[PDB]
Design a protein around this ligand. Structure first.
Ligand code: CL
Ligand code: NA
Lengths: 340, 278, 340, 279
């Protein structure tokens, strides 16, 4: 049982920010304050590939920064775990310079070569919006069992190249990247105390990506009356949190702060209220970034650390839901985290 | 990692492709989709191990096919583990996907996560129904279609090695890539293209990589994936699906332990995982 | 032709009221304060047939009360126009005393004989939640063209016997009846203009289907985002209002008060904003009644009259949407209306 | 009301039922549904008139059938006018349904509404695919199945009459009712039952009602619905669908105006509407 240290974290957002009234949304059906209130969105970024911004370039930038700042030699990284929800990747840097639009490979193989991570086992995982939690979870098990001493975790969401700016859905989602470093801890000050993950496929078909002619993947909605989940909405996230807390031998009251996925304010609140979290024990961050799929969680974690909401020695719960559907929660005892 | 059972379901139709990376491989026909083969493979494994769907703690999927996955042939996401959970009634499972991972790498990672979480029954599935990808006509490279199901019990004791390919150590092997089809006009147009350049020494370099890696566990019998027809009976090869008949031979021979060796054409490496047998 | 007078109106609601926490909802998934606030519902009534309340008996009560109070002789009614959204009728009074649960006949053929409306042409119409407006419109055209002098209009909604009390949707809908009298005017009151249109793009989204353990609500949305209505939500109701206002040679500023169908606070607000209606120029009435399909509009009209929000000489717009989908708006100049 | 064009489509199978209210009537088979029959009737009329679906201002439906309306045979609401609007692309139309109304009455009310709204192209449709209703085995009463499409141009000039039945004045006529099936166990079970008590003088009483009503417009040729087989060649009758061949005969004979007469079995009355014909 080695201790797992969350050592460092950083994010890289798009340079450009877009308001709700921005002309990018001209072909979107007219929307009111009711829509904006409900989803809690004010502004969001989109990558501009013409100014060198994409899923790969911004990760390289963030990862180089984090590695330099945390004094991590590229050679010392034992594993690299990447996620990206879009089925399409767009750039392979200096590694595969001629390759453009692609399905495969995924990021880790390519990124590890680009960064010089000469010992890193590359892995690309998918759990949509919960992928940052999955990746921490994988990293932690490896550290814990002595199979890695340093793990780099990456989530990169370039969703804007797929958004249909004639649709209302386009106003909800946005781009971003996050990178974290996990290490074998020296002392007790940082550890992953417990986690719980579960999935429920009852409503699998409700939100799918499909290849659609005008031609690219698109979001498709399917609801038919012609069964409910074992646990009803909005309890799945709270159930995951309760399981994790029980496994850690803790209660809600033992927790200092909470970090949630950020799909909508009423849903986050519902999750918080389900576990007994008070409004001052978590943040809503979708207002400034939009919904960044897997990147909302780590952006939210980073925000809380940076703003002093989450302090060294705090116990936190991180939790979220994902399409498919999937649910993940983690109970961390945090030490000092380098925000870079 | 202990292998409790294995299930396999391959198309009966084979297609031969010429080239140094060619061979004769199973190929899904017309409208056929992955679930049609995956579901029976999975059931086969559950029945052999006497495990019920509700006893599955984890489902982990590996499938490159960008469409032809489920009844709605145009769905690519979320990935096949999810509808698999649904049609199985695997109501206790956590589900995720490991993308372009090799099987050996996936088993190691899964062994590690799953033993750490106290899971007892873990399903790893590998499949393809690749009508949505153009074959590599220049090299003869194609993916084998079909479904493999591994029902596992984690131990956390699986050992893992990642090795270079053999042959010329200065040779820069050109990896497999799958570019997006930029001219998708009609229904049934491919969504991407398999691109593995013609490299006549590649099959032998992979074999030499296998042989070197096997030397890290010299007392273990080994099983391996066959991605190329070169040198094989009938020029026929089953890709990662070749593993099934070999694992079954091992069970017949009453082996307690073995080394499983994958080839990763994305990374151009070979990867091995040590496994216990029921 | 002739001027159309809205002479009298009444409503009959169920005797029993059901709170949001009522055990009738025990098998419904737990809902929070967020849901109740969003839908604007606090309580609602359901007919109790065991105690003689149903779609027919309450209409008979209300109609007898209205005819007495408006000093209207039964033989003076030239047309009776009835709507009821449920395919099942349950009571034919003294007219067909042995007939219980039935598909046909519809209400007017029976109600006319029960009430002694011995000269009334009976008509049963269907435009779901917009049926009150359709019927006012049919009535008005008859009066205007001199083909009737007095028209009795009925909407009666017994939906609670069809609701699925395992479902969240069951918390939104409720039972009720309305009766109105229209007459040849002179000349304080008139129907200035109307507009009606329909869009079947999303026909299949909300249907009634025979379901073994009898009709049940079925939902069925399958979309890409690419197949929208020619006019996007939520502009269909505003478009109907505008078309009506234009036919009447009026603008929004010429209107004193607005009466809307009552499906949810956000949607009513969207419709109001779409046409220029300020928040104090309409009421939200779903709070103590729930959504009563066709009966929400007349109940809202009546409430506004009764509470002094709408008064003699006021110009009003009445408007709403219905499943199918259908949209209707009316511009009235109102004289004095008998609330009974 | 001016009739621009008419479309009809009847099942090929005629089925005989015995009884005083019996006859040989068209019957939809197996899982046939109303749209299959309605859509071509509608198109026949739109093609004859050269009216495009986008030119239709109003669609008004009349169909008792509690199911077998559309592709999903279990749907009963909203009513058939709405999927019709969808399949046609009738994107300028208003849609509503007049339930158990007679056709004459519907045409009068629609003429009135539509002329007053200034509409130019109005589609009135009448259909049945009545597998979901049990026939009246005691009387022999059944609905004719089929589809009739009337493409109209309103004038607001249509005259209307609602009359009593003929035969014996002292006779109390018992109406059609359609009770709900209270024992729906399987799929394919009927949803309701046709209940029209055996009354052997009823056919003739309706016909005498028709003649009395026609007497109010002695200057007009008339067309009528025939719901009963008693006294008719081979007992054959088409219900409201009888109207189609009569309206076509009228155009061929170059009539400019006519009287159209319906029987309403729910009210046990006859109803007439005066119409112009195209030409
Ligand atoms: Cl790599
Ligand atoms: Na008589």
């Amino acid at each position: 049982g080695h201790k797992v240290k969350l050592a460092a974290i950083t994010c890289e957002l798009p340079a450009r920010s877009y308001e709700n009234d921005d002309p990018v949304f001209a072909a979107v059906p007219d929307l009111s304050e009711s829509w904006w209130q409900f989803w809690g969105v004010n502004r969001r970024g989109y990558f501009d590939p013409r100014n060198g911004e994409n899923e790969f370039s911004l990760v390289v930038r963030a990862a180089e920064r984090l590695l330099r700042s945390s004094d991590t030699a590229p050679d010392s990284v034992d594993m690299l775990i990447c996620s990206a929800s879009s089925p399409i990747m767009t750039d392979a840097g200096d590694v595969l310079p001629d390759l453009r639009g692609r399905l495969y490979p995924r990021m880790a193989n390519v990124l590890s070569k680009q960064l010089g991570l000469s010992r890193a086992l590359p892995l690309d995982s998918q759990m949509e919006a919960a992928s940052f939690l999955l990746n921490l979870r994988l990293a932690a098990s490896m550290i814990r069992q002595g199979k890695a001493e340093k793990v780099l975790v990456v989530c990169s969401e370039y969703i804007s190249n797929l958004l249909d700016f004639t649709s209302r859905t386009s106003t909800l989602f946005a781009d971003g990247c996050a990178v974290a470093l996990l290490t074998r801890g020296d002392d007790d000050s940082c550890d992953l105390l417990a986690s719980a993950e579960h999935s429920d496929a009852t409503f699998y078909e409700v939100a799918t990506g499909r290849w659609r002619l005008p031609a690219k993947p698109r979001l498709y909605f399917s609801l038919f009356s012609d069964n409910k989940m074992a646990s009803f909405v909005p309890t799945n996230v709270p159930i995951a949190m309760r399981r994790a807390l029980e496994k850690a031998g803790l209660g809600s009251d033992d927790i200092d702060y909470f970090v949630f996925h950020q799909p909508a304010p009423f849903l986050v609140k519902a999750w918080a209220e389900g576990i007994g979290a008070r409004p001052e024990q978590y943040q809503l961050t979708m207002g400034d970034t939009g919904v960044m799929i897997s990147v909302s969680i780590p952006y939210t974690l980073m925000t809380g650390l940076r703003e002093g909401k989450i302090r060294p020695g705090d116990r936190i719960v991180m939790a979220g839901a994902a399409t498919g559907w999937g649910f993940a929660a983690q109970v961390w005892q945090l030490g000092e985290v380098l925000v870079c | 990692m202990l292998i409790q059972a294995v299930g396999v379901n391959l198309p009966p139709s084979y297609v031969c492709l010429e080239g140094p990376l060619g061979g004769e491989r199973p190929r899904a026909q017309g409208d056929e989709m992955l679930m049609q083969r995956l579901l029976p493979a999975v059931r086969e494994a559950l029945d052999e191990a006497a495990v019920k769907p509700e006893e599955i703690d984890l489902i982990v999927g590996l499938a490159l096919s960008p469409d032809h996955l489920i009844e709605n042939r145009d769905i690519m996401a979320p990935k096949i583990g999810h509808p698999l959970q649904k049609v199985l009634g695997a109501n206790r499972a956590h589900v995720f996907d490991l993308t372009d991972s090799s099987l050996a790498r996936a088993l190691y990672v899964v062994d590690t996560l799953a033993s750490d979480q106290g899971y007892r029954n873990v399903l790893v599935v590998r499949g393809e129904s690749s009508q949505g990808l153009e074959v590599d006509s220049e090299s003869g490279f194609a993916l084998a279609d079909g479904a493999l199901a591994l029902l596992c019990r984690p131990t956390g004791k699986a050992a893992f090695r990642r090795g270079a390919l053999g042959g010329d150590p200065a040779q820069e092997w050109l990896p497999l890539s799958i570019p997006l089809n930029t001219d998708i006009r009609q229904v049934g147009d491919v969504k991407g293209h398999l691109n593995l350049p013609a490299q006549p020494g590649l099959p032998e370099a992979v074999r030499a990589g296998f042989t070197r890696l096997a030397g890290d566990f010299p007392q273990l019998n080994w099983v391996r994936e066959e991605w190329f027809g070169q040198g094989r009976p009938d020029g026929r090869c089953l890709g990662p699906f070749e593993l099934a008949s070999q694992l079954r031979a091992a069970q017949r021979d009453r082996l307690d332990e073995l080394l499983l060796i994958s080839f990763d054409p994305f990374g151009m490496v070979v990867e091995g995982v040590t496994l216990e047998l029921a």
